[PDB]
């Protein structure tokens, strides 16, 4: 069985500790370290723990929970020197064996199972943008490690060595990396890995953030997936490439169709656009996410879909065949990948199941359009603030049902907690603008 | 004539310079210094100047304007040298036509419309302000002391400067009523007697001028910013208002319940009707809405009541020629000329059309639940500056009273501040997300 | 095939990453790092990427491009780790059509046109560059030493790093000819053997990459900026050029005077004809014209001569298969692909139409008077970057050879730099005028 190979690897690689990973609703990694002597117990009945101290999980009066590891996610952490360490991505179950409704990974699993009913397997291949910042007195800052730009090369790109270190580590963990390059903003970078099913890709996203932040710390740096850490430079975003597969073939490809795109592609897009306002509360979960998604500026805030036009929200790149896909450009890397993929799959399937026609394509540069011109074309915009998107998310009956009322309420609780604090704040901008004059 | 006494004062006090004061749409004082030899020219044909560089005035292609001083506003600045004086001015065009973008002219227009019905509006504002330290010649938001409400020295470290301000004000003709330390650190309040809206607005601009000037002489910075420090009280310009007709207080009616005339209730009904749009004038800054925060001890909930200090409109105890309402939503950063005009037009709309106000609310509105407020139908003010500007655009009455020119200037400056504020990355976001994400 | 040997090298040298190199219109190197597992995909269908964020490439609405590597350009970077390799790429569109904005494709096109007549252009540039100190991790313009021409240690403090660069270059297949300290402080020059224009341009981009990378490893900053220090020499990319037809040097003719063929003179006549417009390509920066200053020891005067090192075009002594002309006006900051293409098209226009060059000038052109230069009809290059861009707009031949797309990109970036440069208030102006005016 799978558990036999796990213990075979432990004896050979001399693994002495296993980390039992999972995420809260926010997507922040959590783990318990156990000696390898408890591994038999962890893979059997599971390791109990107190969930009342995890964000958006359970209450104090019913706090006992259980970690149910996923055997396939077993990897050895390469940065271990005598004394190795391994990790297991876990699901959360209740003491009675019932799956915990609030576990984000279980949510994606549920939505993937529903998609399997209809014969669809959603593949996702995200484009992770991130920043590398300096540390000052052991504390992270928002100072770029280099002042380079798009596709730049050393000596303008000062992070070639650490990016080479990150990619190598990932490959050692079974990743198939496709490309790595310096992004537009100062000290911004992008690592792209090969598409996979939603669950494996989500596990990979959480893993990549762990590896990136870890090695950056070893270099005296700080990696951050925050959407808009610096004002005046490009924000980091998570362009999510998506495609549906059915009967082993790309369900989005249809050679006998215009532009060689099937009606399934169009209906999937129609559903995603139909719910995009509510989805943004998931894919752009921070107050800071809307300082990148700002109306009226060079950002994918205008609800449109087009061909290879990189100013719309949903792009349809040139490749066809088994590479036919759609690129959703609104999400940013701070989102919970399990919940983001779940919300996109739910909306897209709602479009396929119900034959939701998408709007006309907009092959023009939407960024250079006038508000009057946008009104004539009926182009709407995404929520402007976090509170705006949460209100939109509350009303989407399909999304709340697809994510579960437990998860949905936790997302609303943490968001409105951040907002109620942010709206009361007095920022430096207000002093710099009014203090001398008034 | 008035001009003759002005020159009598000049020779006695040996005034050598005269400042020609006015304000842009934002309420910021503007002035030109002319030698006393040019005073005869100013009080006659006026002094020409360039209006293209004043906020919300005229374009570059038709920029020549004329300052027309109001002789009643002549005062000698008590900080001499080489004495100096000042004149508040109305802005006119070269052809003698009044410039309908001038805020002071706007108030004059709405008051003339009130005079058509025989009404004269009186106002008396409670001016809250902060006294902050200067660091390297630049102003800061550090309180000059760490005292509180009605505190006495040594806790109150600004007694000597408040004594100087009140003295200067009284020398300038003010009838000061009281001064005291306010709730927040280094916060204070000076109250002066009421007067007609035009007089009171001139007093408001003068008080800020006197307070800010003397604060500078003491190495401090007086600011009328609404919410300069997070976590402490904010500055609020409570505005007491009353209408007078045929010499008597139109808000008083001894034969009525609570001795409140129907003109009072109708006036309140109209103010509450337009209060969502008035807030763009009375609370014009982005920072204004860090004091007018929903769900906190702040006059955010649209209600009117008696002496209950938690409602938006308060009707204090005094009756007779002292009957008044107190509007507590404004803050000191508003343009007093525009704020009084917007309140006057809205209140007269209530009287003109007999707009019944909602039921009073004498309970503690701050301690009500969101569920309780919905049962009583209590609404809220705009939450942000954009929200209020959007409500101000749709108010056809207010835009017509203030004038399309002034209204457009207000919208332009507000959306300018907003488009800059909404794109900023603030420290709060880095403190909240940088370490974990 | 070539692809088979690439994978043979990968296994032996244990290469794990491959960089896909190219350049924007400005000549700045750009690359994408792909794991060696993706190399099979790159050499087949190619690697797609976004071209909207590359300078002077494509718009946002049609941004999907494809990198198509040239297998001949595969080299292993001698600074290993975890070995790394690189491939120079041509940019194509998703439909397989070549992107006519790609500078490397432009040179290819003009070379194909030269092949139509049986000509192959050869180039060998003399690369002058500076070695500067780093302060707080940022580059500076402080010379690493204070030495001069052909100076030896300890005066020359960059012997160890030049030894490293040449070693790396030779390991990358370069045939290095000589290296030495140049005139200015911390200035140096490395010369490598000539080759065809495409090969040599790849060598130029590689040399700057190797020089700048190793300089960083030693804590320095190598810069190919034309005039980074006022009062010392500037960096110049003398460009030796020759044409080959039927395997022999087309510029050599033993039966002719000075053993110079008519093809040589006609080629020179065409280059001089368009040299005012070529300068926008060969000297593309504002800073380029602080080295090309009229009235100083700099190749500014449009002339051609023999081995006289003061003319714009020099015909060195070697004949036979070494007959060449040396164009001394360019500087290292130019895009070598675009510079070689502009020179080729202009020279072929001279050969095609038999354009007679002006009389040679074998005297010291720098020591001539403005009066003397007018008698001989000697012209001058553009004085500023705007002057050269205006001359480049009117050159219908050059714009057609480089292509309307690349030409427009060049004009856009140049006028962008100029509109920013012309509005600046420089320190020189404050030093000259602030105290007295
Ligand atoms: Mg990107
Ligand atoms: Mg008070
Ligand atoms: Mg030389």
Author numbering:
A (entry chain B): 3 to 84, 87 to 442
B (entry chain A), C (entry chain A): 3 to 83, 87 to 442
Publication excerpt:
The active sites are located at the interface of the N- and C- terminal domains of the adjacent subunit in the hexameric ring. Two loops in the active center are critical for catalysis: the Glu-flap, involved in shielding the active site during catalysis and deprotonating the intermediate product, and the Asp-50’ loop, which binds and deprotonates ammonium.
The enzyme from M. shengliensis was crystallized in the absence of ligands, and two different crystalline forms, referred to as MsGS-apo 1 and MsGS-apo 2, were analyzed. As MtGS, the homolog from M. shengliensis has a dodecameric organization with the N-ter (1-106) and C-ter (107-442) domains forming the protomeric unit.
